[PDB]
Amino acid sequence: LDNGLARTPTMGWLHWERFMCNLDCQEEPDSCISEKLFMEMAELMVSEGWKDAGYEYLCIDDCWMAPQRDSEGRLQADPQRFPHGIRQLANYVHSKGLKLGIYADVGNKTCAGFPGSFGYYDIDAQTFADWGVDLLKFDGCYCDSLENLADGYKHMSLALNRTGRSIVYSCEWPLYMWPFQKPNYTEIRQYCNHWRNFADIDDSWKSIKSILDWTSFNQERIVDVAGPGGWNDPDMLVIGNFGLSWNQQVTQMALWAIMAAPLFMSNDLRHISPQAKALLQDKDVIAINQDPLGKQGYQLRQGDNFEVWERPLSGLAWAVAMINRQEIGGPRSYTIAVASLGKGVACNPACFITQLLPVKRKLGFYEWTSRLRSHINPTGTVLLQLENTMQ
Amino acid sequence: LDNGLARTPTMGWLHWERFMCNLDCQEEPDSCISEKLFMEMAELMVSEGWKDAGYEYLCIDDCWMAPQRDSEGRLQADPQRFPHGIRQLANYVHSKGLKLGIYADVGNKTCAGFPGSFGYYDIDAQTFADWGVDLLKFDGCYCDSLENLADGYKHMSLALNRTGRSIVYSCEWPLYMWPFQKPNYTEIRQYCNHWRNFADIDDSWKSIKSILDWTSFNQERIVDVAGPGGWNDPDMLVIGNFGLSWNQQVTQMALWAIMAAPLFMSNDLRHISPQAKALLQDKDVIAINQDPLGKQGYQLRQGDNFEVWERPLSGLAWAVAMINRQEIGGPRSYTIAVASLGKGVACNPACFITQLLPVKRKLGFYEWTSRLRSHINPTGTVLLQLENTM
């Protein structure tokens, strides 16, 4: 979408995976979907270093709404959980130097069953712009027709544009289309800043694997459409939660960087391990994800329970990720000729290789005829940066 | 098996899951299956507290053998990887106050392709006794028929007995005959100290889940047959490796205790985190696993992506494990009427409840009508001990 936004993948925090649709503020006041939750995360996003690392958008997902629209046909924030209203929340978030994201649905209802925006696109766009909203995530539930789905996503894009306010537009259009027909990514890119392709992530290695496998399976269709202003969205980072081992967490961070993915954390920033925090704030890995060239990476090789992915970067550099998919035994060595990397130009005549995950280490100079050898933990990933040089 | 061994579930270390069949001693000398590896693990079992926690048996799995039997028809340790032989290894292990476990296969070959014991059961049994072996794991690969399989497992049990040496006999009899015929656990129990029922564990939450789900599904068949001298083997503990989150590690430790499982670690004791170590050496949880009454636990309840399991202990105590099987969201509130626990006698008229995992914490006295509210992390478990009080 040519709105001048998302020139690099959008970074922020989104409540959905970790907090879901918890409406139980009586029994669980600190975890329920309410203004206090977002106020606290906004505070922590600044004080704990997330904003300085690039995480800018504090985003509200489903279940923020009152059961019904007001008498003027507007969406309302729930009066018990958001008593001060979204406008005051937006102002609070902006006073911290952050941006506010919000959620709506293209159909009759949101996925959790709250009011949908079908027949209200202009009213809702204008309501969000009035409030000071900076990003909309637009879900695809309760839409009976693929025509209405496509038309709704296009209409809201235009409606947001007409407000005059710059609003990142995050779509789930291809995801709700894929079962029934092939998405047209040239069309989607014109209307959306980023788009969900695949099923909801959860806090599991199985889920990370299936997203990587579906991305690599469909990479011919989706890799080349991504670029400044329009990104593939493989869903939230679940690092810092409960279901991923340390190696599995390194794998998600590494591959979301290779894939030029929006980086939306969904975790409890009040309760995050030093390790997960250091991984998520890793300046070098974030720089890869945010590389200004904006060319999405891809799977190069697959075999022997190993995967090799690579991404072209600016300044003639490349990122290489090698995943160990064997879920038994110990570290396994993988050896690859550097001449097979970066379409033969990454280390021609030479290159400097620096390892970034799971630890930072300079590996030295590699000639075009050299072989690269790494040990990789089961379900772990080694991420390298190849810096091309004529020495 | 009535040999006076495994009166509580056997505890130790087994190389297979973490080290497997690595023969590349040229390029990976510290990780290949060699006498060096087992000598190093032995040293660490003593120095780092493993022996004191109860982990006693240092066990060799597949791929220790030479490609061929010797001229006398005996198995031989690989000459390049075990140049000092198994007898010297057994002596070294015994000098550390530990016991030695070894591996063989009922069929013509081991699963990895080395010499099998079919037609050599008495030779091998005697060879192992002569070496001073204290435990045999006996695998089921390359066995043509169910007749041979059954007869093989029985033959080796008797052969071990005839040596006069006390040897723990660890079988895979039910695992390998399940596909074709329902195992007779009464028969299996008479011949074996423990038995593998299900597929090989690996370093994944998926595999932990599958083992628990298959156990609970089959718990009517297998729970009551367990007891002092004969245990169900859900396979190795994989805590301290690569594929399990912290909560998933706690779940395995808690549930292996509930299930009266043999506790065979398969990890690198040279490279293990402090958390994984503290969990594996947790005296209170190990005491549950090793409860002298030796009654295996079972799934009590399933619903709302929660599972409740319990185990009866000695002295009118119970252990209770509540698992959160929802793999999305945050810690989830679970409330249970304590009157549902221990067949209604656990907290009649009252009980003192102590949480053991993921942290140790006295929770206080509960009356029969009370409700316990826990918070359980996704894929995590809360483990409680209930002490009945008047």
Ligand SMILES: *[C@@H]1O[C@H](CO)[C@@H](O[C@@H]2O[C@H](CO)[C@@H](O[C@@H]3O[C@H](CO[C@H]4O[C@H](CO)[C@@H](O)[C@H](O)[C@@H]4O)[C@@H](O)[C@H](O[C@H]4O[C@H](CO)[C@@H](O)[C@H](O)[C@@H]4O)[C@@H]3O[C@@H]3OC[C@@H](O)[C@H](O)[C@H]3O)[C@H](O)[C@H]2NC(C)=O)[C@H](O[C@@H]2O[C@@H](C)[C@@H](O)[C@@H](O)[C@@H]2O)[C@H]1NC(C)=O
């Ligand atoms: C571990 O591996 C060992 C080596 O492979 C196994 O021993 C084999 O067991 C075979 C049966 O499972 C057995 O096969 C029989 O062989 C008889 C004679 O050999 C013939 O073949 C030779 C070359 O292959 C050849 O040189 C000879 O000239 C012979 O022709 C043969 O008579 C048998 O046939 C019987 O059955 C048929 C069919 O009903 C009748 O028509 C026939 O009259 C006869 O009664 C049989 O051969 C064939 O078996 C397969 C079947 O599909 C064919 O129809 C049938 O013809 C073989 O002798 C040995 N091999 C060796 C080298 O000794 C061992 O098996 C176990 O132990 C053996 C001793 C036996 O007790 C088996 O029942 C056991 O399963 C394997 N053990 C384990 C645990 O896996």
Ligand SMILES: *[C@@H]1O[C@H](CO)[C@@H](O[C@@H]2O[C@H](CO)[C@@H](O[C@@H]3O[C@H](CO)[C@@H](O)[C@H](O[C@H]4O[C@H](CO)[C@@H](O)[C@H](O)[C@@H]4O)[C@@H]3O[C@@H]3OC[C@@H](O)[C@H](O)[C@H]3O)[C@H](O)[C@H]2NC(C)=O)[C@H](O)[C@H]1NC(C)=O
């Ligand atoms: C509603 O929609 C309209 C379009 O339908 C939006 O107007 C468009 O806004 C963008 C804002 O960037 C504008 O794009 C720029 O155009 C000027 C020339 O007029 C260029 O100098 C810009 O290039 C520079 O900046 C970009 C970063 O955006 C950078 O990539 C370049 O290297 C350079 O430094 C930029 O041109 C774009 O460059 C990137 C390339 O991918 C695009 O194709 C190219 O457009 C558009 O001109 C403008 N479109 C029109 C038709 O006027 C409007 O912002 C939007 N309003 C709201 C509220 O959302």
Ligand SMILES: *[C@@H]1O[C@H](CO)[C@@H](O[C@@H]2O[C@H](CO)[C@@H](O[C@@H]3O[C@H](CO)[C@@H](O)[C@H](O)[C@@H]3O[C@@H]3OC[C@@H](O)[C@H](O)[C@H]3O)[C@H](O)[C@H]2NC(C)=O)[C@H](O[C@@H]2O[C@@H](C)[C@@H](O)[C@@H](O)[C@@H]2O)[C@H]1NC(C)=O
């Ligand atoms: C080879 O097999 C035979 C059986 O086929 C083993 O003999 C059995 O060994 C058991 C354990 O040592 C004996 O049971 C014990 O009996 C004594 C006295 O009553 C008692 O102190 C123990 O608590 C135990 O009692 C019960 O035994 C029956 C079980 O139902 C119950 O669970 C136990 O609590 C058992 O009597 C004996 N059976 C027979 C038929 O003789 C034999 O074990 C070896 O012999 C015994 C006597 C002892 O020297 C052991 O150290 C030794 O292992 C076994 N041999 C080998 C080498 O494994």
Ligand SMILES: *[C@@H]1O[C@H](CO)[C@@H](O[C@@H]2O[C@H](CO)[C@@H](O[C@@H]3O[C@H](CO)[C@@H](O)[C@H](O)[C@@H]3O)[C@H](O)[C@H]2NC(C)=O)[C@H](O[C@@H]2O[C@@H](C)[C@@H](O)[C@@H](O)[C@@H]2O)[C@H]1NC(C)=O
């Ligand atoms: C996927 O979506 C893209 C973008 O909408 C489609 O390309 C666009 O197709 C429009 C209508 O077919 C084109 O409009 C034309 O504009 C010119 C102005 O010069 C008029 O003369 C002409 O009558 C049309 O109205 C538009 O040019 C084109 N946009 C872009 C950015 O390429 C695309 O359609 C497919 O490709 C185009 C080039 C044609 O070959 C179509 O026949 C073809 O469907 C969509 N792809 C699919 C598979 O649906």
Ligand SMILES: *[C@@H]1O[C@H](CO)[C@@H](O[C@@H]2O[C@H](CO)[C@@H](O)[C@H](O)[C@H]2NC(C)=O)[C@H](O[C@@H]2O[C@@H](C)[C@@H](O)[C@@H](O)[C@@H]2O)[C@H]1NC(C)=O
């Ligand atoms: C499973 O194995 C059990 C142990 O071998 C069998 O029980 C034993 O059966 C013998 C006769 O086959 C008998 O002499 C033994 O006393 C008895 N052992 C014990 C500890 O009870 C069992 O056999 C079944 O149950 C026995 C009591 C008889 O009713 C048999 O006719 C049955 O087959 C075996 N079960 C099965 C299903 O094969």
Ligand SMILES: *[C@@H]1O[C@H](CO)[C@@H](O)[C@H](O)[C@H]1NC(C)=O
């Ligand atoms: C929404 O449902 C109404 C009936 O409640 C129906 O008239 C309308 O066509 C539906 N629209 C969409 C986009 O699903």
Ligand SMILES: OC[C@H]1NC[C@H](O)[C@@H](O)[C@H]1O
């Ligand atoms: O109910 C909200 C939920 N709906 C489905 C979406 O794909 C999720 O990301 C989340 O927004």
Ligand SMILES: OC[C@H]1NC[C@H](O)[C@@H](O)[C@H]1O
């Ligand atoms: O190859 C050895 C391998 N065989 C199959 C067994 O069940 C495993 O535990 C292991 O011993």
